Design a protein around this ligand. Sequence first.
Ligand SMILES: Nc1ncnc2c1ncn2[C@@H]1O[C@H](C(=O)N2CCN(CC(=O)Nc3cccc4c3CNC4=O)CC2)[C@@H](O)[C@@H]1O
Ligand SMILES: [Zn+2]
Length: 201
Amino acid sequence: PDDKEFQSVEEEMQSTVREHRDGGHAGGIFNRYNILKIQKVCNKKLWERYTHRRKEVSEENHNHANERMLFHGSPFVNAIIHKGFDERHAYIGGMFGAGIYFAENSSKSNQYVYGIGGGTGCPVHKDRSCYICHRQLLFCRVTLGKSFLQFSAMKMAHSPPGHHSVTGRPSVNGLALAEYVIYRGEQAYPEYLITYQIMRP
Ligand SMILES: Nc1ncnc2c1ncn2[C@@H]1O[C@H](C(=O)N2CCN(CC(=O)Nc3cccc4c3CNC4=O)CC2)[C@@H](O)[C@@H]1O
Ligand SMILES: [Zn+2]
């Protein structure tokens, strides 16, 4: 795998960092990361499941898959790489109900690596702002198809009728940053596994 392909992922990871409203409570205090490793995930069965669904979505969306590269933070990265994203692990909870959530800002996804609101932080030091423990984030291929634009909380079980996803747009008394929600696990492929540390400013 080319170093230039990985430089592009590294650049997306670094440039999409934003200052969070919680002052770093969930994901820690940092302006940049120390990127340790970028691995391309090659799971043929998951890739075929993804491309089969992408073709179905494109056909239902004027021959346009509306694919985006987006981040996903989770304590379950290893199960995701082996078994794929699974909506059965999603329960009504979160702004847009029982879906699989993605961010275009790496720092947003970083707030979910150790759990919701950062959980209790890293397993070894119980620190949400740990600068020592190595974190992992996924940089995913996500099929949005016809995405339903929403500003306020809308607890869905599935995509709205005629749609393939939900796009959560930033609003005054709502989201600070965008979020993208799918309700079918086969609509995302965990393309890159990023191993990194947040860096002390
Ligand atoms: N194959 C699998 N095996 C085990 N767990 C799996 C799995 N595929 C997905 N999951 C897991 O399911 C969990 C899940 O759906 N949940 C729990 C969390 N909840 C809220 C939410 O996702 N918010 C949210 C908002 C914005 C970005 C991000 C997130 C999460 N990660 C991000 O980057 C929505 C429902 C998630 O923590 C994880 O990805
Ligand atoms: Zn730690």
